[PDB]
């Protein structure tokens, strides 16, 4: 029943990564370690959007990764991250991108599978194209993902009102058609 819902996956997370009973408010309280998670479901086609809100001053990266990726988002060729210090990450390369963000900020995460485009907004401000989906990643489902270092975030896949509704024909990830969505490979009993 856990994989049937759009939420963060208790079966696909670091040891210190904790998920609230809503499935959406997440934290990791280990001071010197990064702990990550992926959502229960992933996207294979379409233009979609989710939001994440920062609840404190801890470090975090948010974005998308495939099932082959490390939960340490952006440290391999299967993940894309945007981090609070104003850096995008992919294949262990951290580049200046966008703006810094922190407590009280909301990051919008845009994914256009059909055009192969990843981009982000901060409090409704378009930060620009962050990544193109590379040839090696084509035809592979992308799951919302984060990694935290002594931080707390809250996801919104579309089941609650968006603080900054998506532009340009992107729609809530939770409203993606059934045939364009893929269940996580990480499951169990609840």
Numbering used by the authors: 86 to 275
What did the publication describing this PDB structure actually write?
The β-sandwich fold is slightly twisted and forms a bowl-like platform. Two layers of concave β-sheets stack together and are referred to in the following as β-sheets 1 and 2, and a third small β-sheet covers one side of the β-sandwich.
SPRY domains are known to function as protein–protein interaction platforms.
